[PDB]
Design a protein around this ligand. Structure first.
Ligand SMILES: [Cl-]
Length: 105
């Protein structure tokens, strides 16, 4: 299951609620083609890694001031443990996505 995160407060609360679980965040845009191509794989991963938390952010929802949306290329995947960013890369590369979850879990 992937949780859609639509605000900064929801984002921060999700990272706190995770506890010791790895958190994976897909920052995507509804106009980005490669984001569409990888999205069902991201949801498949969420069923597989059932103790990892998967969040999706539509960057059109990012605040213009004081945002946690610190990204440049779509899609961007960020990885957090106990609220700290522990990994990040951009690009719809499925093998790199699953490899990074395994490296950080
Ligand atoms: Cl897991």
């Amino acid at each position: 299951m992937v949780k859609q995160i639509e605000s900064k407060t929801a984002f921060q609360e999700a990272l706190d609620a995770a506890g010791d679980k790895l958190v994976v965040v897909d920052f995507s845009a509804t106009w980005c083609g490669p984001c569409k191509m990888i999205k069902p794989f991201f949801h498949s991963l969420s069923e597989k890694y059932s103790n990892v938390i998967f969040l999706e952010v539509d960057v059109d929802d990012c605040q213009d001031v004081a945002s946690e949306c610190e990204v440049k290329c779509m899609p961007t995947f960020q990885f957090f443990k106990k609220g700290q960013k522990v990994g990040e890369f951009s690009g719809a590369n499925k093998e790199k996505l699953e490899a990074t979850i395994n490296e950080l879990v």
